Paper text:
Tailed double-stranded DNA (dsDNA) bacteriophages and their eukaryotic counterparts, such as herpesviruses, possess a dodecameric portal at a unique vertex of the capsid; this portal serves as a channel for DNA packaging during viral assembly and delivery. The portal interacts with multiple copies of a [name] (SP) to form a nucleation complex, which initiates the assembly of the major capsid protein (i.e., coat protein) and other minor proteins into a procapsid. The [name] procapsid consists of an icosahedral coat comprising 415 coat protein (gene product [gp] 5) subunits, a dodecameric ring comprising portal protein (gp1) subunits located at a unique capsid vertex, and an internal core comprising approximately 250–300 SP (gp8) subunits and 3 ejection proteins. In this study, we present the structure of the SP gp8 in complex with the dodecameric portal in the [name] procapsid at subnanometer resolution.
Three column-like structures, each interacting with two neighboring nodules, were observed on the GOF nodules. On each GOF, each column connecting two neighboring nodules consisted of a three-helix bundle. The three α-helices were contributed by the column domains of the inner base-associated gp8, the outer base-associated gp8 from the neighboring nodule, and the side nodule-associated gp8. These three SP subunits interacted through the three-helix bundle, forming an SP trimer. The gp8 subunits interacted with the neighboring portal subunits. Each trimer interacts with two neighboring portal subunits.
Residue numbers in the entry:
A (entry chain C): 68 to 245
B (entry chain B): 70 to 245
C (entry chain A): 71 to 245
The structure:
């Protein structure tokens, strides 16, 4: 039951392990415009340069070069940037897979699967990112308080109105409770 | 005892830095037909014999080639970093293997396993010995002790493939 | 005391403070020009055919970007190689340093200090470290005898440094 959403997670991590990364993951380069050929090869430009192709193209070269060296510098910057992001999402995907696996193990030991569906419905209510936080920090910080979190949704939002680290402190203390 | 000291010496030599070449990832560069073929009969035919459509065609082709080639080799570099940190993890794991294996080797209360390990080195390459002491070093000492006792089983395991030979080594550890 | 600043400069290297000498510039071959080919003479080579000319344009841009990135990758590989190499030979220089020392204070000479100053003035720390690298067991002793023979030392310093090391080995065998 609850392991099905773990399988959805397995598909998002499959998008990473297979290399079939999401389109939004990839980042396009930001480049200065290519110099305009017709800005100089216009017949009006030819009259400017006495109907000579060679002289129009000297300016054309100036314009074009710098653009291509900037292109290669931006390509190096882009390989660095996008490789960094792909790596980081790789570690995030891993941490998610083992964290979710352990969390669903704990929920299975909790042996109340019919509560896990409403639990996760509450998570896609407004804590998707908070669910990711649960996964990354420690997936099972409060077992019976997870039931209560299902139970406490409003005062759940009350608790979530306050920031992440202090919320971690509150979750640790309520774990000391449950 | 000295085999330990050389093992770590080599291995913190590994940690403070050096890298082999295996981690390199070949970038992916997608080929593509050129604008000469695009103004050719086939290219113009697929663009309905329009030169301006071919102009848009090669401009889009360059832009998308930038897009996809960039994504390809940047993912290749990301995987290169992945395998580099994997190499770091393997180095740390082999450190643990060396330390615990040559710490537990003396717990047998006997020194005669040294020549048995030397016989294992002769029969079986030291790289495979490092691998096996990495996998499970708790019975490794008795493992090459008995292997030096019976080199015939060492040869018969060397004949067979590495993974199934490892499985049989695990069985030999078990029925001890 | 020279040993102490030997180590401080050694780990000064070890914090990545590599000299500019280790910065190796990758070679970028000249960029192809669109204007060598879409101009009057280039299209004359191309018989005024813009299709082939702009095809050469595209191919040149693609291959130039590819060779630029290849040069970058080669620069990365070689810079890593040189960095690791120089770290290693730094390790052997500091080796020669402290084995030279511990051997020297193992020996029971009365007048170590001033002769050590004189030769460290005469030979750079790297040169001395290489001296111990080639001859480690009694580099101190070759320094002692050279102080007992700095004249030749002079002839020596006058003559080739590598050949100076050759003559140092010669006299070390001679004693």
């Amino acid at each position: 039951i609850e392991r099905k959403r773990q399988r959805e997670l397995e598909q998002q991590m499959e998008a990473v392990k297979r290399g079939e990364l999401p389109e939004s993951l990839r980042v396009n380069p930001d480049l200065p415009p290519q110099p305009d050929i017709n800005a100089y090869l216009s017949e009006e430009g030819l009259a400017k340069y006495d109907y000579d192709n060679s002289r129009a193209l000297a300016a054309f070269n100036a314009a074009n070069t710098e653009w291509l060296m900037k292109a290669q510098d931006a390509r190096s910057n882009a390989v660095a940037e996008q490789g960094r992001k792909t790596q980081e999402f790789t570690q995030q995907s891993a941490q998610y897979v083992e964290a979710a696996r352990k969390h669903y193990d704990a929920a299975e030991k909790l042996n109340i699967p019919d509560y896990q569906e409403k639990e996760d419905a509450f998570m896609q209510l407004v804590p998707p990112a908070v669910g990711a936080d649960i996964m990354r920090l420690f997936p099972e910080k409060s077992a019976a308080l997870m039931y209560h979190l299902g139970a406490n949704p409003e005062k759940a939002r009350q608790l979530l109105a306050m920031d992440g680290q202090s919320a971690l402190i509150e979750l640790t203390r309520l774990s000391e409770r449950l």
